[PDB]
Design a protein around this ligand. Structure first.
Ligand code: LIB
Length: 334
C-alpha cells in the first residue's frame, strides 16, 4: 500500500497517493470533482475524479458500483478507461471514498469554437468508440458535446457512457417522449445532432422544452408516415403527433447547404425518426464519408459485459461491498 497525503481544494478534501502530484481543480458536480495531476510513475498528466458521496443512498451506491464496473471494462482508444482506482480506506469498514484516474484530456466539444476533415475525423472516432460500447450491449443514452473529450491533436474519447446512469438538444425523439423501449440507435441520433452542429456551428434542435424539441425535430425530418405511426403504443404520443398539422421531410441539402454532400447523406441516415431504420455505428463507419479513416481491421468490438447487477435491488452495504471487491481486484493496464 502506497503513502497518501491530504489537501483541501475548493470546499472539498482530497486524500490521494504520493504517486499523484500537483492537483489543480478542473470541474465539478453532484457526482464528483476532478483534478488534473501529474502521475510520477509514468510522467503523464492525468485526471483524478473523487466521487462525491458514493454510498449516501442505495442509489448512490448502485451508481458508484455501475460506474466502476463500466470503467473497469472499457478498453478502447476512443473510450475513457481506468488507469487507476483507489481508496484511502484500509478496510471495507472504513470504506467511504472512491477515486478514479484516467488520462487527462484538454477540452470537450461544446468548448470547441469546424472544417470538413475536422468533422470527419471527430465523428469517425465517436462512431469507433460507440461501435465498441454498443457491442457490449451498452447504450450511452446521453451523448453530447460536453461528454466528448478531445486533445489539441484531435484525439477523442467518450466520457460517462453506460449503463443506466441543454442535453435535451441531442436526445432522440423516442427517448424524449417516453417510448421507453428504445435501442442503441438513440446514440446514433445524438451523433447526427453533434455532427450537424460541428459542420454548421449551431445547435440543430434548440428546444426550450421537450414538446418544442419534438416540434423542431418534426420540422426537419417530417411527421411519421403511417408505418412508424403504427409502432407507437401510446395513444398519448400517437394522438399528439396525429394532432400536429402535417409537415414534409425537408431535403437535407438545402438545410445543410454548402456542406460536403457525403456528410449530408450520412446525416440523412442518422437522423431518421424510426429507430428501426437508423444506421448503426458499424454501418456508419463503412459509409463513404469516412473513406480517409475507415479500416475494418482496426474497429474493435468489446468483451461481453455482465450488467445483470442492473436488475438487482440490494442493500447499501451490499452495493458498497461489491464496489470494494472491484477496487481490490483492479489490475492496472500495462
Ligand atoms: C476514470 O476516471 C475519470 C477521471 C476524470 C474524468 N473526467 C471528468 O469527469 N471530467 C469532467 C466531466 C464532467 C464535468 C467536468 C469534468 Cl472536469 C475527465 C477525464 C479526462 N479529462 C478531463 N478533462 C476535463 C478538463 C474536461 C475536458 C472533460 O472538461 N476530464 C472522467 C473519468
Amino acid at each position: 500500500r502506497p503513502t497518501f497525503y491530504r489537501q483541501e481544494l475548493n470546499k472539498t478534501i482530497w486524500e490521494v497517493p504520493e504517486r499523484y502530484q500537483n492537483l489543480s481543480p478542473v470541474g465539478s458536480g453532484a457526482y464528483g470533482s476532478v483534478c488534473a495531476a501529474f502521475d510520477t510513475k509514468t510522467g503523464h498528466r492525468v485526471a483524478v475524479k473523487k466521487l462525491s458521496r458514493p454510498f449516501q443512498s442505495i442509489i448512490h451506491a448502485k451508481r458508484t458500483y455501475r460506474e466502476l464496473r463500466l470503467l473497469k471494462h472499457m478498453k478502447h482508444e476512443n473510450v475513457i478507461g481506468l488507469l487507476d482506482v483507489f481508496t484511502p480506506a484500509r478496510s471495507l469498514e472504513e470504506f467511504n471514498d472512491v477515486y478514479l484516474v484516467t488520462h487527462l484530456m484538454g477540452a470537450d466539444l461544446n468548448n470547441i469554437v469546424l472544417t470538413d476533415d475536422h468533422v470527419q475525423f471527430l465523428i469517425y472516432q465517436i462512431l469507433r468508440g460507440l461501435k465498441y460500447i454498443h457491442s457490449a450491449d451498452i447504450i450511452h443514452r446521453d451523448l453530447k458535446p460536453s461528454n466528448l473529450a478531445v486533445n489539441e491533436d484531435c484525439e477523442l474519447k467518450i466520457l460517462d457512457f453506460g449503463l443506466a446512469r441543454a442535453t435535451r438538444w441531442y436526445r432522440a425523439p423516442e427517448i424524449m417522449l417516453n417510448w421507453m423501449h428504445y435501442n442503441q440507435t438513440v446514440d446514433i441520433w445524438s451523433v447526427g445532432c453533434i455532427m450537424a452542429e460541428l459542420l454548421t456551428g449551431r445547435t440543430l434542435f434548440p428546444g426550450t422544452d421537450h414538446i418544442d424539441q419534438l416540434k423542431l425535430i418534426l420540422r426537419l425530418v417530417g411527421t411519421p408516415g403511417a408505418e412508424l405511426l403504427k409502432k407507437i403504443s401510446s395513444e398519448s404520443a400517437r394522438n399528439y403527433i396525429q394532432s400536429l398539422a402535417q409537415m414534409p421531410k425537408m431535403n437535407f441539402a438545402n438545410v445543410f447547404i454548402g456542406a460536403n454532400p457525403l456528410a449530408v447523406d450520412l446525416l440523412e441516415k442518422m437522423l431518421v425518426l424510426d429507430s428501426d431504420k437508423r444506421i448503426t455505428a458499424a454501418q456508419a463507419l463503412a459509409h463513404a464519408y469516412f473513406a480517409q479513416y475507415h479500416d475494418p481491421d482496426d474497429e474493435p468490438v468489446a468483451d461481453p459485459y455482465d450488467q445483470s447487477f442492473e436488475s438487482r435491488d440490494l442493500l447499501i452495504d451490499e452495493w458498497k461491498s461489491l464496489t470494494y471487491d472491484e477496487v481490490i481486484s483492479f489490475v492496472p493496464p500495462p
